Amino acid sequence: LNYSSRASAIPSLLCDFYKTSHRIMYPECSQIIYSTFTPRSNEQAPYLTQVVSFGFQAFIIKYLIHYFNDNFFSRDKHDVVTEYSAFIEKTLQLEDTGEHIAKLHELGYLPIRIKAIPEGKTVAIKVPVMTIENTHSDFFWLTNYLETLINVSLWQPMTSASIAFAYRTALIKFANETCDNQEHVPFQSHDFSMRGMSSLESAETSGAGHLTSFLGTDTIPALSFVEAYYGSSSLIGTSIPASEHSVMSSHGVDELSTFRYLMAKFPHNMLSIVSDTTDFWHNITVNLPLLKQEIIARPENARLVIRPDSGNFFAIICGDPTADTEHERKGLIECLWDIFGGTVNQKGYKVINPHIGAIYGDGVTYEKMFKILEGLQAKGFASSNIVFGVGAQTYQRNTRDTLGFALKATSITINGEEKAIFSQKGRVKVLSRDTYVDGLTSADDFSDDLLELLFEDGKLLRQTDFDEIRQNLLVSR
Amino acid sequence: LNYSSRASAIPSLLCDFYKTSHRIMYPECSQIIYSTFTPRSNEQAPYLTQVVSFGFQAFIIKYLIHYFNDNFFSRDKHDVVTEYSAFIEKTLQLEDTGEHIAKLHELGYLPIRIKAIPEGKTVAIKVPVMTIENTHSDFFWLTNYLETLINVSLWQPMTSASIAFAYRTALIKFANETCDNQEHVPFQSHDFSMRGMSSLESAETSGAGHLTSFLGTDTIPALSFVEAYYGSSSLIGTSIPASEHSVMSSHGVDELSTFRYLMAKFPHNMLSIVSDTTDFWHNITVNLPLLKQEIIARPENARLVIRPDSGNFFAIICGDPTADTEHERKGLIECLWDIFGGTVNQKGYKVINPHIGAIYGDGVTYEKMFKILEGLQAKGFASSNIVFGVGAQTYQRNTRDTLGFALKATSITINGEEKAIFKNPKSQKGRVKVLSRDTYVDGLTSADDFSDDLLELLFEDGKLLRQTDFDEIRQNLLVS
Ligand SMILES: NC(=O)c1cccnc1
Numbered sequence: 029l030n031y032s033s034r035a036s037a038i039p040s041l042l043c044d045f046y047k048t049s050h051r052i053m054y055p056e057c058s059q060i061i062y063s064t065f066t067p068r069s070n071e072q073a074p075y076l077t078q079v080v081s082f083g084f085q086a087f088i089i090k091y092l093i094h095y096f097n098d099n100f101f102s103r104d105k106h107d108v109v110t111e112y113s114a115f116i117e118k119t120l121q122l123e124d125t126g127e128h129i130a131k132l133h134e135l136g137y138l139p140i141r142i143k144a145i146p147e148g149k150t151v152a153i154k155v156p157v158m159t160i161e162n163t164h165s166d167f168f169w170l171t172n173y174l175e176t177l178i179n180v181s182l183w184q185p186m187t188s189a190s191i192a193f194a195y196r197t198a199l200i201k202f203a204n205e206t207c208d209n210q211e212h213v214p215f216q217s218h219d220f221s222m223r224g225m226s227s228l229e230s231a232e233t234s235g236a237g238h239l240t241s242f243l244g245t246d247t248i249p250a251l252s253f254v255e256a257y258y259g260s261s262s263l264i265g266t267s268i269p270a271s272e273h274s275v276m277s278s279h280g281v282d283e284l285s286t287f288r289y290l291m292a293k294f295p296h297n298m299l300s301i302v303s304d305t306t307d308f309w310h311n312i313t314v315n316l317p318l319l320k321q322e323i324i325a326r327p328e329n330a331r332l333v334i335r336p337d338s339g340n341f342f343a344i345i346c347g348d349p350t351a352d353t354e355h356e357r358k359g360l361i362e363c364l365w366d367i368f369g370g371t372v373n374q375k376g377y378k379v380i381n382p383h384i385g386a387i388y389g390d391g392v393t394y395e396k397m398f399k400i401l402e403g404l405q406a407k408g409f410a411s412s413n414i415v416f417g418v419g420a421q422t423y424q425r426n427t428r429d430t431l432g433f434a435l436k437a438t439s440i441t442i443n444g445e446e447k448a449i450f451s452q453k454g455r456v457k458v459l460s461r462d463t464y465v466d467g468l469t470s471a472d473d474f475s476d477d478l479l480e481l482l483f484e485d486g487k488l489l490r491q492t493d494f495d496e497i498r499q500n501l502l503v504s505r
Numbered sequence: 506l507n508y509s510s511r512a513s514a515i516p517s518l519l520c521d522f523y524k525t526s527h528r529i530m531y532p533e534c535s536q537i538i539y540s541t542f543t544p545r546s547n548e549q550a551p552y553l554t555q556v557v558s559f560g561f562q563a564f565i566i567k568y569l570i571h572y573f574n575d576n577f578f579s580r581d582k583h584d585v586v587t588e589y590s591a592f593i594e595k596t597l598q599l600e601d602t603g604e605h606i607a608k609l610h611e612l613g614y615l616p617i618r619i620k621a622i623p624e625g626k627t628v629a630i631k632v633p634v635m636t637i638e639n640t641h642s643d644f645f646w647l648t649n650y651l652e653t654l655i656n657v658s659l660w661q662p663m664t665s666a667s668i669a670f671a672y673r674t675a676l677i678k679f680a681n682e683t684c685d686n687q688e689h690v691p692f693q694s695h696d697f698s699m700r701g702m703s704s705l706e707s708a709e710t711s712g713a714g715h716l717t718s719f720l721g722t723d724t725i726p727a728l729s730f731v732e733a734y735y736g737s738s739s740l741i742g743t744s745i746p747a748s749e750h751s752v753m754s755s756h757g758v759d760e761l762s763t764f765r766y767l768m769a770k771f772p773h774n775m776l777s778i779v780s781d782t783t784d785f786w787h788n789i790t791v792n793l794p795l796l797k798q799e800i801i802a803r804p805e806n807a808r809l810v811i812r813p814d815s816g817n818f819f820a821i822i823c824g825d826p827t828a829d830t831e832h833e834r835k836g837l838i839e840c841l842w843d844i845f846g847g848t849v850n851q852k853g854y855k856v857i858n859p860h861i862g863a864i865y866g867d868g869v870t871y872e873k874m875f876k877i878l879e880g881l882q883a884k885g886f887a888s889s890n891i892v893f894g895v896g897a898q899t900y901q902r903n904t905r906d907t908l909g910f911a912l913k914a915t916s917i918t919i920n921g922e923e924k925a926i927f928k929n930p931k932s933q934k935g936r937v938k939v940l941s942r943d944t945y946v947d948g949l950t951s952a953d954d955f956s957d958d959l960l961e962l963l964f965e966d967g968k969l970l971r972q973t974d975f976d977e978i979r980q981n982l983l984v985s
């Protein structure tokens with residue numbers, strides 16, 4: 029959209045250094061490189077059984093169209109080539125005249141053709157999600173030249189999106205046993221991760237990935253990102269006012285006043301109050317009873333949400349048999365049940381008085397979330413009683429090997445002959461969610477391909493919005 | 506910095522959402538918020554015993570100066586404020602006039618004062634590396650508001666630089682035991698990580714951190730990133746021509762031909778050839794002897810470097826005693842020793858013929874690198890015989906909890922009184938002064954001394970007050 033960052037990365041050198049040397053290492057009369065992008069393995073995260081296609085549109089627009097147009101094709105040819113040549117002389121000591129860079133510049137666009145799975149659709153592990161190839165014989169080198177830029181910018185949004193989807197899967201499973209409806213699920217995983225992401229750019233694409241399965245986020249720039257590259261008719265994401273530790277302790281030690289003060293500031297909004305700044309169980313067992321009348325007086329769409337931020341994840345929410353105190357043996361959810369109202373649903377699980385709520389957002393991971401819900405189900409509490417603030421220990425603590433993303437070349441054309449290069453071999457076609465076929469030539473029939481032409485020769489050929497992406501994911505279930 | 510990328514982040518909403526609700530939550534007559542950025546623990550990575558200060562200068566310039574000048578202060582004001590109000594309107598159903606945003610805009614600069622450890626200096630775990638506060642009473646909320654952007658963009662460069670330092674420390678330690686000199690050390694950790702970083706921005710700052718201790722990198726944007734924000738007189742980074750699997754297999758299964766083809770293409774440069782596309786040990790035990798004559802004829806400055814990319818990291822390099830074949834029972838390094846020349850140095854370790862080299866860059870981690878070097882020294886091989894391609898399993902496989910980074914507010918001024926704020930569910934209180942490398946004092950007020958503070962004033966009221974270049978950073982780190 030209408031803002032801008034100053035950049036240093038040279039468009040024609042947006043790669044691993046060694047890719048500059050590959051053009052002349054290729055056989056003579058090389059014409060076409062065909063490559064595949066694949067989530068090859070989930071042994072490091074077996075709960076990720078579906079890979080959610082997400083991020084391509086943003087990547088195409090930001091880098092392949094805008095970054096190259098703004099900083100390469102728009103600039104003067106002589107300056108761009110002289111910079112490339114000069115770099116290769118200082119760093120490495122060889123004469124590269126950059127004549128291939130100039131030829132590309134004269135072309136005016138990337139002779140690149142990309143097919144990808146529609147965003148919001150999902151595929152099994154080991155199924156290709158993207159293919160790329162060059163469309164002009166002189167630029168065989170360009171396909172793999174772009175390998176570095178492709179997955180430095182795409183593996184994170186898909187891993188985030190696929191993690192979000194797996195969370196929702198677990199949350200729906202629990203709602204089917206403990207809850208009469210699933211109205212709470214779009215809000216049950218709230219993105220907390222921004223401050224712990226490795227950079228703002230990683231915060232936008234990972235946050236955007238979370239928004240494909242959930243409405244709750246604290247990463248405002250992820251909202252702005254989804255709006256700039258995808259768009260939707262309704263609100264992209266939602267959030268609530270919430271206190272932080274500095275706010276609580278700046279009000280001193282009488283937290284009974286601070287609770288009351290903060291609740292007056294947000295009379296008609298949902299409001300989270302971090303409650304462990306001084307003495308958590310004092311807040312829960314002493315001040316919450318004193319506030320009960322004021323709590324239940326607030327409108328239902330303005331519930332007070334209690335946020336612990338310390339102690340063992342399971343014991344705080346579900347309780348510790350190892351005692352000393354019953355409040356510690358019962359845990360937060362049972363304590364709120366004792367204090368405030370509640371009902372029992374058709375499925376037979378306790379639902380807390382909807383005037384009070386609870387959020388745990390302290391290093392939340394998938395197995396911690398799962399254990400907590402298993403804990404609550406065992407005590408007879410509906411899974412809708414807890415919200416999870418999901419942070420960097422979920423969305424930052426990944427690598428390209430979480431789902432095993434690799435962009436590997438699988439077919440080459442030399443002197444008019446196409447040969448498979450060595451998983452997959454040759455050109456690929458995706459038949460369903462969990463099956464694909466390879467060993468294909470460019471003459472074969474791709475009519476029934478799930479991979480959809482996306483970008484070719486500088487043009488975005490097919491555009492989606494975030495409403496379509498989210499609908500595609502509903503159907504995926 | 507003569508390029509630009511298109512941006513989506515709204516300057517005045519560039520934060521955790523709940524920070525927008527915090528301004529009206531603070532006590533009335535709040536004036537100054539003072540915060541510290543501290544690496545509190547290395548329990549998750551005990552090999553990181555020192556924190557390398559790195560990344561502040563670039564962050565200040567890119568974001569606190571350029572991004573806010575380009576996208577906020579230079580913009581309209583009515584448009585900038587209306588955008589903020591409308592967002593608050595959509596998302597909180599609350600009516601915020603955006604006056605505080607307008608007051609910021611009328612000010613023309615961030616009323617912000619920042620002290621930091623000079624870049625390249627080093628600090629013990631648990632010592633604050635940066636403090637920030639507001640310089641204008643109306644803008645207490647601004648300190649709070651910037652917490653999210655500060656560590657979304659600063660913990661990674663410091664963690665990468667701190668990892669690089671720990672690597673170099675280990676390599677120097679081994680070079681001291683096994684090697685006559687340590688000229689090999691600046692190239693022994695080569696940055697492979699770019700494709701495995703989570704974004705280009707993270708690749709730039711992590712790669713920059715790597716370049717503070719090492720010259721070898723494949724992350725071209727990390728070089729030009731260092732160029733733009735720091736500058737350097739000496740060489741920032743270097744690399745060599747090297748093949749990839751797609752190059753090898755497009756030539757087919759006759760790799761002996763391919764080797765000859767590739768080394769003919771780069772007769773006057775060092776050249777790495779990935780060697781496991783079809784049959785690794787066939788290339789090692791058959792093709793390398795057939796090429797020995799051709800290899801050793803190449804110039805000093807143009808060695809061939811063999812790149813394994815599969816198998817067990819230790820077994821490939823150091824050998825597997827349980828293995829069924831003699832070449833596998835010894836390592837790649839002993840095999841290269843048998844095939845090509847070698848000498849024994851003053852320290853008594855074998856140094857392979859410098860016409861041939863070896864690089865391992867397949868999921869390299871600090872203990873993996875360490876185990877391999879124990880492997881080679883146990884065999885009597887100098888630690889200089891191997892180069893490590895260090896990838897995303899080192900620089901992407903981190904979180905902010907690797908070094909325990911936390912940005913906490915420690916002092917608030919309310920109605921002209923400074924109060925320590927803290928939680929007791931590090932726990933600093935008040936203003937901090939770093940007395941030495943490994944010690945600081947914290948119960949301070951703004952009236953105290955602060956002479957000779959290791960945290961040195963860096964940015965104030967829109968101005969970068971103190972700037973370094975990449976040479977000073979490397980010099981500080983050498984003396985460290
Ligand atoms: N209470 C919150 O909204 C929050 C957001 C991000 C991180 N921690 C807490």
Ligand SMILES: NC(=O)c1cccnc1
Nearest residue numbers: 215218268300333387415
């Ligand atoms: N209870 C919640 O949905 C929620 C959302 C965001 C932050 N804290 C709590």
Ligand SMILES: NC(=O)c1cccnc1
Nearest residue numbers: 044046697723747777866
């Ligand atoms: N051999 C190399 O230069 C290299 C660079 C990046 C990743 N893998 C290998």
Ligand SMILES: NC(=O)c1cccnc1
Nearest residue numbers: 692695745777810864892
């Ligand atoms: N310095 C080296 O040996 C080397 C090997 C591979 C890639 N880059 C550098």
